[PDB]
Design a protein around this ligand. Structure first.
Ligand SMILES: CCCCCCCCCCCCCCCC(=O)OC[C@H](COP(=O)(O)O)OC(=O)CCCCCCCCCCCCCCC
Ligand SMILES: CCCCCCCCCCCCCCCC(=O)OC[C@H](COP(=O)(O)O)OC(=O)CCCCCCCCCCCCCCC
Ligand SMILES: CCCCCCCCCCCCCCCC(=O)OC[C@H](COP(=O)(O)O)OC(=O)CCCCCCCCCCCCCCC
Ligand SMILES: CC(C)CCC[C@@H](C)[C@H]1CC[C@H]2[C@@H]3CC=C4C[C@@H](OC(=O)CCC(=O)O)CC[C@]4(C)[C@H]3CC[C@]12C
Ligand SMILES: CC(C)CCC[C@@H](C)[C@H]1CC[C@H]2[C@@H]3CC=C4C[C@@H](OC(=O)CCC(=O)O)CC[C@]4(C)[C@H]3CC[C@]12C
Ligand code: NA
Ligand code: NA
Ligand code: NA
Lengths: 665, 151, 50, 670, 127
């Protein structure tokens, strides 16, 4: 038509006007008119006590929403249908819920899995949780053997258990509860692709709660009782184990880790940086001196001097550096199909390489292979030392059963494969110095931010590999007929003339891959025969390959690393310090400590368990006490008043008005 | 502008140390693979800085020059051939040179671009209260007397 | 110089104590003040009429 | 020592404790105790009425800060030293300032240039400004013929005049006051490098006030009275003249500009885009047809059809396109030291080129040369058409006094210079199609964001030119001895062998500039002699040039354009639409309208009524501005409520309204 | 808490702050950071200082060079040094009517206070 009519499609009764006057007697604070209009009941025409607005409001919800306790006592003095107005007295954090606890299909606003203590934990109010725990209450355990209720109810149970007041109360120690809950919520967010950002939010909440309990630690020894509690530094090992990156860098914990790393240098962290370079240089130069001791006399000044974990680092890394200077020195010497162990250089090498292999097997004895293969540098050590085993095995196999052509060799002659795998193992060996950056404060966070962009790069090179397969199938399919010149070496590519570029598929992959860079020229796409159409179509395919790879995809990779590096650099210095305490805390243990070539060559238990246990529970009593005081202090300074606070003050003037006018009139 | 660039320089110099370790890495690899199969001492010119580019990965210093100039498109592919006929060492040397070009030119250089984006956004907030500080250093270097006689 | 600094510290303290007002954010405890100023006053006036 | 003592270094008296009880009688709201402790005066031991806290608070400031008007009436009933507690009653926007107006070296908190109406305008409260303007008041004029007071007082005067309530009140029309004040504050921020971000803030405030007065325009014709007020569309021309980029795109103004651009296509902006491409294609194809009309019959259907400004654009740009297709077609023809006018193609060209030159001189008649040289595309037209004059002049000079070597020419033979300048003028001519993007809604904001990054690029290439001069002086200084091979052509560079690269300074600048790209190889830095040290030092200088230019500076240019493009793309679509209404509004005027070859030729082939209208338009416009200022002031006073932030002093009001009331009720029951 | 009135109410009675220098470990760095956090407040520099420009400049220097010493608590000593560097700029913002400015920027205990301000890298004091 010309208009459109608007009718209430979904309509209740709604109310009687006398009942509307009764609900207008509440929401104003009338202690007189509500009492009269409630005593008019049991006549009982015609107002029922349990009257319901078009918008909820079961006549006791109004006495809670407009926070008035006298009308709650008046309505609970009579028989108002309470269920479930206790839960509505928990969202608003009204501590009139005492009156709903101590005394007395219908459109619940809440999902029927919600018990009072679950919604008490969701609102994170410490007082109401303590008021419920003194009565009951039990939470269901989440595990199991129609579908929205199951995942929703499981997320309400985990959302209730992850609150920092049912971990403050109702937990043996809240550090294990925060660590294990952060683990189960993280690994539970990986399980369910749906609700991922909510379980990650709850695991972040648990990871922040533990950091704030460390923030409430004053006066070490209170810190060292926490960071030693074995049910060494067992709680930091267990904290690194659960990837609690904010627990570490408390920053109170970095003083304990930093002094234990420096024990006991008098003021090393205050000296000039060049003096630090001289001391690290001459301590790094004397690495056979300190490490022949602890084999002669481990109870001595020098035998206790390599037990300092800063003296372990420099000089594990100094021994590693002389291995790398010696690999520099390997290629400047003597320059036979069967050799010796060549030269004297490799006769020097063999204890270093057997030292690294013993270091990796020894590292896989205590831990792994999950925690071993989790870190990428250990995988790189496996590839490096595996290529060292292949190299020395092909050198020994080369010494036997061979004796002498100069260069006309088999092309799979084991000397050549030994030298090639040896060179690849020198690349992987000398890229390990990048992993030595996490000890430095300037080169540290940089290295870890790059290492976190690598996983976003590796997601991108798969698309590029599909573009290589695409244009490689195209260009091979177009040029395997018109191009095969087998009449003269050199063959192309890696050649002065670049003859056959798109003949085979492998040479086509090499041609496109090197054509990322400006290393493959245009005369590559000619045909020895005269076919200008297939040359133009092949050159256009090569051109759209260069546009998609070099203009479209590579700048999308630049943009991707901009957005990734802006997300990474927020959480740097709390993720650099985590990897720095992994590197620091790899040198705290003993034996352990011998740099690479020199690595191989009873009622008192119950008394200590009750003493450490009650001591730790006393410290946690102090921390939970002052933490709850701290967060209840921080609930004030939020700099935002919701409108319902005005709904409180406006009633406190209104009801008072209807009391004073009740006394003067 | 000049002072914002001068404040990005200290973030660049932290990055070129990583790149120098990548040069030492692939230089040790490629020298270690090519000091046997490549030494042609029979004719000048020697390579590189040469019309033919003969011996590129022979010595370590020429290998550092070869990788450093291979940042730019100034070193070609026929560099990684052997005068002898060993296709496996040529392919492994060319793959090492290829992963050097990917790590240096696709991974690290665009990470340097991203690093200078995040640095230049942090710097340009505090520009014009840090330009004016260096401007009053330059101004206030000319207030004193004697001092004043041009060079 | 101490007279000039007397003037500057005087008007500076007046300036920052002026800027402590315009913060555009009221903490909840400000409501905990007004709510008592109505409440205690109530328990005084009811102490005089009853 | 071991401690450090803390003593009050800067100390007043401070107060008597009885006086402290008097100032404690205020700040609680005691109407009884203040009245008693004021009637104890004239005894007068020992409380003085004008008592001053250690922190200001001259005993009437407390009655204003804690907003209580009864204590202001009580204190002003007696003789309290008022000056200057009127000004303190303006910051808080207390409208008890009436009581400080109608009735009655000491540490003023305010700079002594501050009058009441200046600080009234700084707080932007409409009511207090109207309460002061009804009494006085005058503001000093800023111009002139020890130094902090002068710039501070000038910035308070301009800060007071730029407030949207002394432009709402106290102005003949607030659009001229907002436009001229935004101009004087912008061009005043350019003058003073100091206080730049404050005068730019005030000019932005004036530029927003005019946009909000356009936002209060309902019901055109109320809009068209505004946008036609000549003291055409004179107010939009005057608004583009003062660079009011937010006034334009009201978006109510873009409907008036958009309907006038389309007049009167029935629903052109609703059709399918390919149908729009067909209609623009066949209207663009018939550009001699519509433009031979308006010379035959300007009062006709076709003569009124080219008066449509959308039909002017396509097809000015269609004629320009056939000029560019004809420049494509110039290089596919015939391929003599003295020629004709070559070929028949250029015999077709000459009316187009004389049409562009007549278009630029005709454009410089009405306007310029400031507004002409302000836009860069007009400067590009000057360079383009100047190269066209040089080209046709060297073709005519080539036709005379020459006649026939094939190629062995003078190398400055005027045919070669004519062809080179002709090619450069074809680059500058065919880069004009980028300026045609502002009409399109997709290609429009992109082009203008790039054009705004260009000025940040040109600041960067000066540094790069200093790096070219640096490494050019180095490499020339190292290689002008060891490298000069004058025995064989070719010379290098632009050569198959690249012989002498760093010999002269000009060839060194070419060598480094082309070595930005991978176009110059390494064997360039050899010496014909055998000096390995100078070859290694020259190659290291070339290497650090490649690192500074290609790794350091070029990625700093990338980062610079990231930060610039993020700042630009906020203010896109309110700066694209400004340049779109410049392009639109260049086609509204008449004659004007004849596309390039047909501009000069008959077509080429190869009184009391003035006072009555001034009072009628003037009182009509003032009535419309009365409506707009009325509903605008109502709108902003509505928006002063919804700020979503309560300062603490609001709590200082309510807490007194309970307190003083308490000390009244307890005064009646006790 | 930076409240000027309560600080003046305490300074009229006592009070003394310990000096930070020295010859179990959380209390030492925490207490040193509370002492420097208390001395860096712009109301114990407004009161209780001979001139607050030397106190703001020297405190900003000791808090910056103290944040370089301790890698832990770096972002808190940098925050306090930024607070001291802003306090001096706001005291310059309260300077009306040169000659009041030139008395400040010439006070030798030339332009000695600007040389001493550039010396302590007070980049916001300048401008
Ligand atoms: C598809 C998944 C990957 C992501 C999607 C990619 C988006 C689609 C890519 C578009 C295709 C590339 C264009 C076609 C290539 C091509 O023309 O290459 C084919 C040939 C190139 O020369 P040949 O003809 O000799 O091969 O084109 C020509 O004949 C010459 C005229 C064409 C001019 C090309 C204009 C396109 C602009 C591309 C360069 C942009 C540079 C950016 C800096 C300003
Ligand atoms: C390690 C510390 C530094 C930072 C970490 C770097 C991350 C790891 C880098 C991955 C290794 C590089 C890939 C291997 C190099 C290589 O294959 O180079 C080795 C050769 C290259 O040709 P040759 O075989 O002739 O040498 O590979 C081939 O045989 C051809 C087929 C391989 C195609 C490569 C596909 C990988 C994609 C890389 C290009 C991405 C371009 C981006 C624009 C879209
Ligand atoms: C100065 C104002 C401009 C801005 C300031 C610029 C900052 C300072 C620039 C540093 C100087 C450049 C380095 C020296 C050049 C040079 O060595 O060039 C000189 C030569 C290059 O080869 P030649 O010796 O044959 O000339 O160096 C060598 O001999 C080879 C070994 C050096 C290896 C260079 C390692 C430096 C890393 C630079 C590449 C970074 C690539 C980034 C991608 C990961
Ligand atoms: C410049 C190019 C030629 C590379 C030079 C190779 C080595 C001389 C460099 C490469 C990485 C450097 C290492 C990078 C990081 C560290 C950690 C750093 O140790 C610390 O920061 C001490 C811990 C602390 O400061 O608390 C100094 C030693 C060391 C091993 C550096 C020693 C010297 C190394 C091995
Ligand atoms: C040199 C010769 C070969 C011409 C080749 C270029 C043309 C194919 C393209 C380049 C830019 C294009 C122009 C880009 C922008 C516009 C504006 C656009 O006009 C509009 O957006 C209509 C206004 C509106 O949409 O309200 C469409 C025509 C035009 C001139 C396009 C017409 C076709 C042009 C000239
Ligand atoms: Na390892
Ligand atoms: Na290139
Ligand atoms: Na023009």
């Amino acid at each position: 038509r010309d208009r459109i009519p608007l009718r209430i499609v979904r309509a209740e009764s709604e109310l009687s006007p006398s009942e509307k006057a009764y609900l207008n007697a509440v929401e104003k604070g009338d202690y007189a008119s509500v009492k009269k209009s409630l005593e008019e009941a049991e006549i009982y025409f015609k107002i029922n006590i349990n009257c319901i607005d078009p918008l909820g409001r079961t006549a006791l919800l109004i006495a809670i929403e407009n926070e008035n306790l006298e009308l709650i006592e008046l309505l609970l003095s009579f028989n108002v249908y309470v269920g479930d107005a206790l839960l509505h007295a928990i969202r608003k954090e009204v501590v009139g819920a005492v009156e709903l606890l101590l005394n007395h299909k219908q459109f619940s606003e809440f999902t029927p899995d919600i018990t009072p203590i679950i919604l008490a934990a969701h609102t994170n109010n410490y007082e109401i949780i303590k008021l419920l725990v003194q009565k009951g209450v039990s939470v269901p355990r989440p595990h199991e053997v129609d579908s929205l209720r199951h995942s929703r109810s499981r997320l309400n149970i985990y959302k209730a258990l992850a609150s920092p007041s049912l971990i403050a109360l109702s937990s043996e120690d809240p550090f294990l509860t925060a660590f294990q809950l952060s683990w189960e919520l993280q690994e539970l967010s990986k399980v369910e692709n749906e609700f991922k950002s909510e379980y990650e939010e709850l695991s972040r909440q648990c990871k922040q709660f533990a950091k704030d309990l460390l923030d409430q630690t004053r006066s070490s020894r209170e810190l060292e009782i926490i960071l030693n509690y074995r049910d060494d530094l067992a709680r930091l090992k267990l904290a690194i184990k659960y990837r609690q990156k904010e627990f570490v860098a408390q920053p109170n914990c970095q003083q304990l880790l930093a002094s234990r790393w420096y024990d006991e240098f008098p003021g090393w962290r205050r000296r000039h940086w060049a003096v630090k370079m001289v001391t690290c240089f001459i301590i790094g130069l004397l690495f056979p001196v300190f490490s022949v001791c602890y084999l002669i006399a481990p109870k001595s000044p020098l035998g206790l001097f390599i037990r300092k974990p800063f003296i372990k680092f420099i000089c594990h890394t100094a021994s590693y550096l002389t291995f790398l200077f010696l690999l520099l020195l390997a290629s400047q010497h003597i320059d036979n199909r069967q050799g010796p162990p060549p030269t004297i250089v490799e006769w020097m090498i063999l204890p270093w390489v057997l030292g690294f292999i013993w270091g990796e097997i020894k590292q896989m004895w205590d831990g792994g292979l999950q925690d071993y293969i989790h870190d990428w540098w250990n995988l790189m050590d496996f590839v490096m030392n595996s290529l060292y085993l292949a190299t020395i095995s092909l050198k020994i196999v080369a010494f036997v059963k061979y004796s002498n052509p100069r260069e006309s060799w088999d092309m799979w002659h084991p000397t050549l494969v030994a030298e090639a795998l040896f060179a690849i193992a020198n690349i992987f060996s000398s890229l390990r110095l990048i992993s030595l950056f996490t000890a430095n404060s300037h080169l540290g966070p940089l290295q870890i931010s790059l290492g976190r962009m690598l996983l976003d790069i590796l997601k991108f090179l798969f698309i590029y590999c599909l573009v290589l397969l695409a244009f490689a199938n195209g260009l091979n399919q177009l040029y395997f007929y018109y191009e095969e010149t087998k009449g003269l070496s050199c063959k192309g590519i890696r050649c002065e003339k670049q003859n056959n570029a798109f003949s085979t598929l492998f040479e086509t992959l090499q041609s496109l891959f090197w054509s990322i860079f400006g290393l493959i020229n245009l005369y590559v796409t000619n045909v020895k025969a005269q076919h200008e159409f297939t040359e133009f179509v092949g050159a256009t395919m090569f051109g759209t390959y260069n546009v998609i790879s070099l203009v479209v995809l590579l700048n999308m990779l630049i943009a991707m690393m901009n957005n990734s590096y802006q997300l990474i650099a927020d959480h740097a210095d709390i993720e650099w310090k985590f990897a720095r305490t992994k590197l620091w805390m790899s040198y705290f243990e003993e034996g352990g400590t011998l740099p690479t070539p020199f690595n191989v060559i009873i009622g008192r238990r119950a008394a200590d368990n009750l003493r450490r246990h009650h001591q730790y529970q006393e410290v946690m009593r102090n921390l939970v006490k002052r933490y709850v005081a701290a967060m209840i202090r921080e609930a004030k300074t939020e700099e935002g008043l919701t409108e319902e606070n005005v709904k409180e003050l406006k009633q406190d003037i209104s009801s008072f008005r209807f009391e004073v006018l009740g006394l003067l009139r």
